[PDB]
Every structure is written in C-alpha cells, then in structure tokens.
Design a protein around this motif. Sequence first.
Motif, PDB file in Angstrom:
ATOM      1  N   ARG B   1       0.809  -1.110   0.053  1.00 35.20           N
ATOM      2  CA  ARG B   1       0.181   0.014  -0.252  1.00 35.20           C
ATOM      3  C   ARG B   1       0.887   1.217  -0.058  1.00 35.20           C
ATOM      4  O   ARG B   1       1.917   1.265   0.041  1.00 35.20           O
ATOM      5  CB  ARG B   1      -0.795  -0.156   1.159  1.00 35.20           C
ATOM      6  CG  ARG B   1      -1.758  -1.103   1.149  1.00 35.20           C
ATOM      7  CD  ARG B   1      -3.003  -1.488   1.993  1.00 35.20           C
ATOM      8  NE  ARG B   1      -2.320  -2.110   3.376  1.00 35.20           N
ATOM      9  CZ  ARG B   1      -3.123  -2.495   4.326  1.00 35.20           C
ATOM     10  NH1 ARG B   1      -4.166  -1.961   4.324  1.00 35.20           N
ATOM     11  NH2 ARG B   1      -2.355  -2.731   5.538  1.00 35.20           N
ATOM     12  N   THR B   2       0.088   2.393  -0.265  1.00 33.40           N
ATOM     13  CA  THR B   2       0.926   3.607  -0.160  1.00 33.40           C
ATOM     14  C   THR B   2       0.546   4.366   1.110  1.00 33.40           C
ATOM     15  O   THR B   2      -0.594   4.518   1.654  1.00 33.40           O
ATOM     16  CB  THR B   2       0.558   4.477  -1.284  1.00 33.40           C
ATOM     17  OG1 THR B   2       1.096   4.176  -2.433  1.00 33.40           O
ATOM     18  CG2 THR B   2       1.031   6.207  -1.088  1.00 33.40           C
ATOM     19  N   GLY B   3       1.500   4.738   1.801  1.00 32.98           N
ATOM     20  CA  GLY B   3       1.488   5.539   3.217  1.00 32.98           C
ATOM     21  C   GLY B   3       1.016   7.038   3.095  1.00 32.98           C
ATOM     22  O   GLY B   3       1.314   7.623   1.944  1.00 32.98           O
ATOM     23  N   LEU B   4       0.046   7.303   3.727  1.00 33.06           N
ATOM     24  CA  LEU B   4      -0.282   8.881   4.117  1.00 33.06           C
ATOM     25  C   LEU B   4       0.454   9.370   5.113  1.00 33.06           C
ATOM     26  O   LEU B   4       0.940  10.624   5.068  1.00 33.06           O
ATOM     27  CB  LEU B   4      -1.643   8.883   4.115  1.00 33.06           C
ATOM     28  CG  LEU B   4      -2.466   8.515   3.226  1.00 33.06           C
ATOM     29  CD1 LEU B   4      -4.180   8.641   3.574  1.00 33.06           C
ATOM     30  CD2 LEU B   4      -2.423   9.344   1.947  1.00 33.06           C
ATOM     31  N   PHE B   5       0.930   8.593   5.774  1.00 32.99           N
ATOM     32  CA  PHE B   5       1.771   9.081   7.324  1.00 32.99           C
ATOM     33  C   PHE B   5       3.025   8.209   7.442  1.00 32.99           C
ATOM     34  O   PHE B   5       3.020   7.011   7.278  1.00 32.99           O
ATOM     35  CB  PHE B   5       0.832   9.107   8.522  1.00 32.99           C
ATOM     36  CG  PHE B   5      -0.185  10.195   8.229  1.00 32.99           C
ATOM     37  CD1 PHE B   5      -0.394  11.499   8.620  1.00 32.99           C
ATOM     38  CD2 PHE B   5      -1.558   9.474   7.828  1.00 32.99           C
ATOM     39  CE1 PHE B   5      -1.319  12.314   8.480  1.00 32.99           C
ATOM     40  CE2 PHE B   5      -2.502  10.507   7.640  1.00 32.99           C
ATOM     41  CZ  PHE B   5      -2.559  11.804   7.998  1.00 32.99           C
ATOM     42  N   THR B   6       4.012   8.681   8.063  1.00 37.17           N
ATOM     43  CA  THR B   6       5.159   7.858   8.606  1.00 37.17           C
ATOM     44  C   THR B   6       4.856   6.774   9.488  1.00 37.17           C
ATOM     45  O   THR B   6       4.056   7.108  10.496  1.00 37.17           O
ATOM     46  CB  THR B   6       6.109   8.790   9.295  1.00 37.17           C
ATOM     47  OG1 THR B   6       6.515   9.801   8.489  1.00 37.17           O
ATOM     48  CG2 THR B   6       7.647   8.044   9.487  1.00 37.17           C
ATOM     49  N   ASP B   8       4.977   3.949  12.376  1.00 39.91           N
ATOM     50  CA  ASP B   8       5.275   4.032  13.841  1.00 39.91           C
ATOM     51  C   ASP B   8       6.281   2.625  14.091  1.00 39.91           C
ATOM     52  O   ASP B   8       6.764   3.072  15.038  1.00 39.91           O
ATOM     53  CB  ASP B   8       4.093   4.054  14.496  1.00 39.91           C
ATOM     54  CG  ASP B   8       4.442   4.697  16.135  1.00 39.91           C
ATOM     55  OD1 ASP B   8       5.556   4.900  16.304  1.00 39.91           O
ATOM     56  OD2 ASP B   8       3.280   5.005  16.790  1.00 39.91           O
ATOM     57  N   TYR B  87       7.610  -2.374  26.424  1.00 33.99           N
ATOM     58  CA  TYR B  87       6.605  -1.404  25.925  1.00 33.99           C
ATOM     59  C   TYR B  87       7.110  -0.108  25.567  1.00 33.99           C
ATOM     60  O   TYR B  87       8.303  -0.004  25.922  1.00 33.99           O
ATOM     61  CB  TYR B  87       5.557  -1.213  27.316  1.00 33.99           C
ATOM     62  CG  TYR B  87       4.378  -0.188  26.732  1.00 33.99           C
ATOM     63  CD1 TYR B  87       3.125  -0.744  26.369  1.00 33.99           C
ATOM     64  CD2 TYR B  87       4.564   1.369  27.100  1.00 33.99           C
ATOM     65  CE1 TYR B  87       2.205   0.223  26.048  1.00 33.99           C
ATOM     66  CE2 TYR B  87       3.453   2.058  26.631  1.00 33.99           C
ATOM     67  CZ  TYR B  87       2.289   1.532  26.222  1.00 33.99           C
ATOM     68  OH  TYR B  87       1.452   2.392  25.794  1.00 33.99           O
ATOM     69  N   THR B  90       5.295   6.748  24.813  1.00 32.06           N
ATOM     70  CA  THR B  90       5.613   7.984  24.050  1.00 32.06           C
ATOM     71  C   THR B  90       4.984   9.220  24.778  1.00 32.06           C
ATOM     72  O   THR B  90       4.752  10.406  24.045  1.00 32.06           O
ATOM     73  CB  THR B  90       5.487   7.812  22.585  1.00 32.06           C
ATOM     74  OG1 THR B  90       4.019   7.579  22.468  1.00 32.06           O
ATOM     75  CG2 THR B  90       6.290   6.756  22.186  1.00 32.06           C
TER      76      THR B  90
END
Lengths: 50, 98, 51
Positions: B1-6, B8, B87, B90
């Motif tokens: 697929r193509t990412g819209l966001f970086t 994680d 874990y 963030t």
Amino acid sequence: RTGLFTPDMAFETIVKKQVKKIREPCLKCVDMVISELISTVRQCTKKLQQ
Amino acid sequence: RTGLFTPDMAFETIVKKQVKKIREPCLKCVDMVISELISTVRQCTKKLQQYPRLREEMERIVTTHIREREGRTKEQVMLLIDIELAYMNTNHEDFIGF
Amino acid sequence: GDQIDTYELSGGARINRIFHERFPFELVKMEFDEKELRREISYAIKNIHGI
C-alpha cells in the motif's frame, strides 16, 4: 500502544464504510434503464402491428 | 500500500535495537561494586588480629555472602532492561506531533 | 487487522490504555493535611538530634 502518528487504517476503514453506501443507487439506475427499454419495446410493438 | 503518514513501527524497531546495547556496562558496574565491597571488608578485618582463626572465618563468611548476591543483582539488572523493551511509552516528555 | 468496530465502542482491550491513563488519577486521589506533615517533620528533627 501509545500513538505517535495517525494510523493509515483510520483512513481506509472510513473510506470503505463510505463506499459501501453507493451499492443501492446503482441498482436503482439499472432498474430505471430496464423500465425504459420495456417502454420503448412496447411503443415499437403494440402500436404498429394489427 | 501507499502511506499517508510515517509508520510507527520503524521508531519502535530503531529504539529497541539501540536499547539492547546497554546490558554490558551495567554488569561491569556490578562487578566493580562487588570488588570494592570485598576490599572494604578486608580492610575492616585488620583490627581482628589479636586472635588467629577468627579473621579468616569472618572474611570467609562475609566474602561468600557478598559474592552470592551477585546472582540476584545481575538478574534484576537484566529484568529492568527487558521491561524497558516490552513497551514503548511516548506520553512521558517528547516531541508530540511533528 | 481490518474490520475494526469504528462505530459501536471504544473497546476490545483499548480500555487498558484508559487504566494506563487512569492510574495517573489514583496517584493524585491521595491527599494529606499539611499541618500533620509539619508536625511530623518537627518531631523527625527533634528525634534525630537526640541530645
């Protein structure tokens, strides 16, 4: 997990849900086209033949 | 697929790879502390010289106990790192967003 | 995975992140009266200096 960036499935799962809604009007369009074909056949058949 | 966001998971992967390197210096520190305690005990036992066979016994007992604690200390030191790998928090103090 | 419950709930073990963001509430539910803290400190000092 704690979120750093917006997940890409939050877009995909909303788009799929929006896209599922258009199944109905396409079938309504098909039924209307069939209705018009039937009407045209009647005009070309019942009115001109004794 | 193509990412819209970086994605994680790259962040988590890099952090885990760097965190794994910390085990070595902690064990070096533990070994240094054990040596220092043995030195101090052997100094404290100088005054017990009026009698023989009581200085060796007290050095043997205290030294043995101090060495035995090596196992429990190293085990806890390893666990405190595995806990830092399980874990990824963030929400402590960080660059939220960007 | 896919097939997430986008409408009905906030659920399916996502409740646990509330505990991880609810425990920070329990840690501040506790309270003390400052006058007892001052009295206790005063006696701690007087009890450390014996004579």
